[PDB]
Amino acid sequence: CRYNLACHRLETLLQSIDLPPLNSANNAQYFLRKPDKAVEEDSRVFSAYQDCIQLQLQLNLAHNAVQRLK
Amino acid sequence: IGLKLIDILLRNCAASLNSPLLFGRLNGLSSDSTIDILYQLGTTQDPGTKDRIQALLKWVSDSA
Amino acid sequence: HERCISVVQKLVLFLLSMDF
Amino acid sequence: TSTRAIVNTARSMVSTIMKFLDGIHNFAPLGTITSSSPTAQPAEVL
Amino acid sequence: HLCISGTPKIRLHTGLLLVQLCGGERWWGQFLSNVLQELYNSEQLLIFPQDRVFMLLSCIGQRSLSNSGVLESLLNLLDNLLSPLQVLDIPMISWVVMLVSRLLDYVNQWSFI
Secondary structure, three states, X not given: OHHHXXXXXXXXXXXXXXXXXXXXXXXXXXXXXXXXXXXXXXXXXXXXXXXXXXXXXXXXXXXXXXXXHO | OHHHHHHHHHHOOOOOOXXXXXXXXXXXOOOHHHHHHHHHHHHOOXXXXXXXXXXXXXHHHHHO | OHHHHXXXXXXXXXXXXXXX | OOXXXXXXXXXXXXXXXXXXXXXXOOOHHHOOXXXXXXXXXXXXXX | OOOOOOOHHHHHHXXXXXXXXXXXXXXXXXXXXXXXXXXHOOOXXXXXXXXXXXXXXXXXXXXXXXXXXXXXXXXXXXHHHHOOOOOOOHHHHHHHHHHHHHHHHHOOOOOOO
């Protein structure tokens, strides 16, 4: 339940994330100086992404522990 | 020149050793700026409005 | 090295064609 | 005409690519300091 | 399938694996240019780590630069991309030139670069 909730969080945060293509000078500047809002979005995504990975490991361990007993 | 501008923003922005070239930019690239320009051209009420819309639709059909 | 000249010639044209 | 006569010095995707491949900065420490006078004390401490 | 979307270790090993196996084939340089054309032309909508894949391609070309076809084909792509001067795809040209520049310098006044 929690891992699905964490996975849902990652999707909601990423659905507002956009990747400019590297085909214009304005896009090059985007990559050169990440604007503060862009930096914050990456910080939230990284924090949220860590939660998903932690819960993914626990879910596999919980599945593996339950499978050992079964 | 509205048709020329539509061609520049949508179709071909290249210049028409001293002559201007403007080879440096991809055709049809969009930004907030180009979108605003295209919207004001489309929704501006004037004799040319129809023709401009026509050009837009033409570019659509051509693309398809 | 004829193709080398071609690319170099086109590179110079690019150099000479560079604008804003 | 002037737009024809100028090249943009603003950094572009080539500079971004170079950055991806790994206010002013002091390069003296990276350099080697010598003197033409044979009797001068070595100046690397500078 | 693997180098574009794969993990960094899979990406790295697939690239290095491809060099060790097919780096010495005549079509190898064409493959690199075709990959370069397909992946970095401005008509490509595929989203992938261009920078990471480009680093791989630069690495791959260096490890296969003994094959004369690598630089030959890369310059042919640059030749074809610049033909409009003699429409130019400046982003594609930038990728090709930087790849070609890094490969050639592996082949002092330019040390500032």
